[PDB]
Amino acid sequence: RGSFVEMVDNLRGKSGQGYYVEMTVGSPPQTLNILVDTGSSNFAVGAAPHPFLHRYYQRQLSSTYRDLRKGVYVPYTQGKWEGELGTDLVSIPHGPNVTVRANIAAITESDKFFINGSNWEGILGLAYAEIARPDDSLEPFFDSLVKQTHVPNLFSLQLCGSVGGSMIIGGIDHSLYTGSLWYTPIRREWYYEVIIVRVEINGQDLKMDCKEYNYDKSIVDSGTTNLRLPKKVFEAAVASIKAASSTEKFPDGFWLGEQLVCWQAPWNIFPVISLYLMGEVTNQSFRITILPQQYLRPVEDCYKFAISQSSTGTVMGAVIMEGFYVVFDRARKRIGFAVSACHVHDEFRTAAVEGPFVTLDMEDCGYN
Ligand SMILES: C[C@]1(c2cc(NC(=O)c3ccc(C#N)cn3)ccc2F)N=C(N)O[C@H](C(F)(F)F)[C@@H]1F
Ligand code: NA
Ligand code: NA
**Is any ligand 1 atom within 6 A of the Cβ of residue 37?**
yes
Q: What is the domain count for the chain? A: 2
Q: How far apart are CA 366 and CA 345, in angstroms?
A: 32
**CA atoms in the 13 A half-sphere facing the CB of 306:** 27
**Is any ligand 1 atom within 6 A of the Cβ of residue 153?**
no
**Is any ligand 1 atom within 6 A of the Cβ of residue 76?**
yes
Distance 300 CA to ligand 1 centre (A): 21
Q: Is residue 14 part of a domain?
A: no
Q: Which amino acid type is present at position 36?
A: V
Q: Is residue 39 part of a domain?
A: yes
Residue nearest to atom 26 of ligand 1 (CA): 76
In what side-by-side order are the strands of the sheet with 227-230? 193-194, 218-220, 314-316, 227-230, 307-310
> Is residue 85 domain-shared with residue 223, that is, in the same domain?
no
Q: Give the resolution to one decimal, in Å.
A: 2.2
Residue nearest to atom 27 of ligand 1 (CA): 76
Q: How far apart are CA 258 and CA 278, in angstroms?
A: 33
> Is residue 231 domain-shared with residue 119, that is, in the same domain?
no
Q: Which amino acid type is present at position 142?
A: F
Q: Beta 307-310 vs 164-169: how paired, if at all? A: unpaired
> Is residue 169 domain-shared with residue 130, that is, in the same domain?
no
> Is residue 142 domain-shared with residue 179, that is, in the same domain?
no
| 168, β-bridge pairs | 156
Sign of torsion over alpha carbons 141, 146, 152, 153: positive
Active site residue 252: no
Q: Is residue 128 part of a domain?
A: yes
Cα–Cα distances (Å) from 167 to 182, 220, 222, in that order, read 19, 15, 11
Helices (H) and strands (E) in the chain, counts: 4, 26
> Is residue 127 domain-shared with residue 170, that is, in the same domain?
no
The one-character DSSP state at 258 is S
Q: How far apart are CA 11 and CA 33, in angstroms?
A: 9
- Contact between 129 and 41 under an 8 Å Cβ cutoff? The reply is yes
Distance 328 CA to ligand 2 centre (A): 16
> Is residue 156 domain-shared with residue 40, that is, in the same domain?
no
The one-character DSSP state at 10 is -
Active site residue 143: no
Question: CB pairs under 8 A, 24+ apart, for 247-256?
Answer: 254/305, 255/305, 256/305, 256/308
> Is residue 120 domain-shared with residue 188, that is, in the same domain?
no
Q: Is residue 7 part of a domain?
A: no
Residue nearest to atom 28 of ligand 1 (CA): 224
Q: Is residue 12 part of a domain?
A: no
Q: Tell me which of 151, 172, 204 is where a domain ends.
A: 151
Which residue of 43, 52, 76 sits with most ligand 1 atoms within 8 Å of its CB, as the best mutation to test the pocket? 76
Q: Is residue 103 part of a domain?
A: yes
| 88, β-bridge pairs | 102
**Is any ligand 1 atom within 6 A of the Cβ of residue 223?**
yes
Distance 26 CA to ligand 2 centre (A): 22
- Contact between 109 and 171 under an 8 Å Cβ cutoff? The reply is no
Q: Is residue 66 part of a domain?
A: yes
Distance 328 CA to ligand 1 centre (A): 18
Which residue of 35, 45, 311, 343 sits with most ligand 1 atoms within 8 Å of its CB, as the best mutation to test the pocket? 35
Q: Which of 160, 235, 229, 158 is nearest to 196 (CA)?
A: 229
Distance 175 CA to ligand 3 centre (A): 5
Q: Tell me which of 102, 118, 151 is where a domain ends.
A: 151
> Is residue 335 domain-shared with residue 229, that is, in the same domain?
yes
* Residue 203 CB neighbour total at 10 angstroms: 9
| 277, β-bridge pairs | 196, 286
**Length of the chain, in residues:** 368
Q: Is residue 321 part of a domain?
A: yes
CATH number at residue 56: 2.40.70.10
- 114: which residues sit within 8 A by CB, 6+ positions away? 46, 50, 52, 53, 121
| Helix, strand, or coil (residue 58) | coil
Check the chain for breaks (C–N over 2.5 Å) and list the residue before each, or none: 161, 265, 300
**Is any ligand 1 atom within 6 A of the Cβ of residue 224?**
yes
> Is residue 226 domain-shared with residue 342, that is, in the same domain?
yes
- Contact between 18 and 223 under an 8 Å Cβ cutoff? The reply is yes
Which residue of 20, 40, 321, 322 sits with most ligand 1 atoms within 8 Å of its CB, as the best mutation to test the pocket? 40
> Is residue 249 domain-shared with residue 120, that is, in the same domain?
no
Give me the domain span that covers residue 318.
152-368
SS3 letters for 280-295? CCCCEEEEEEECHHHH
Of 37, 88, 173, 329, the active-site residue reads 37
Rg, C-alpha atoms of the chain: 20
Q: What letters, b where the CB count within 10 A reaches 16 and e where it falls short, cover 159-190?
A: bbbebebbbbbbbbbeebbeeebbbbbbbeeb
Distance 226 CA to ligand 1 centre (A): 10
Atom of ligand 1 nearest to the CA of 118: 8
Q: How far apart are CA 367 and CA 350, in angstroms?
A: 32
> Is residue 230 domain-shared with residue 90, that is, in the same domain?
no
> Is residue 122 domain-shared with residue 109, that is, in the same domain?
yes
Maximum distance among all Cα pairs of the chain, rounded to whole angstroms: 64
Q: Which of 31, 158, 173 is nearest to 92 (CA)?
A: 31
- Omega before residue 140 within 30° of 0, cis: no
**Is any ligand 1 atom within 6 A of the Cβ of residue 113?**
yes
Q: How far apart are CA 262 and CA 301, in angstroms?
A: 5
The one-character DSSP state at 189 is B
Q: Tell me which of 126, 151, 176 is where a domain ends.
A: 151
* Residue 350 CB neighbour total at 10 angstroms: 15
Cα–Cα distances (Å) from 241 to 52, 220, 229, 293, 306, in that order, read 38, 23, 14, 14, 13
Which residue of 14, 15, 21, 37 sits with most ligand 1 atoms within 8 Å of its CB, as the best mutation to test the pocket? 37
Q: How was this structure determined?
A: X-ray
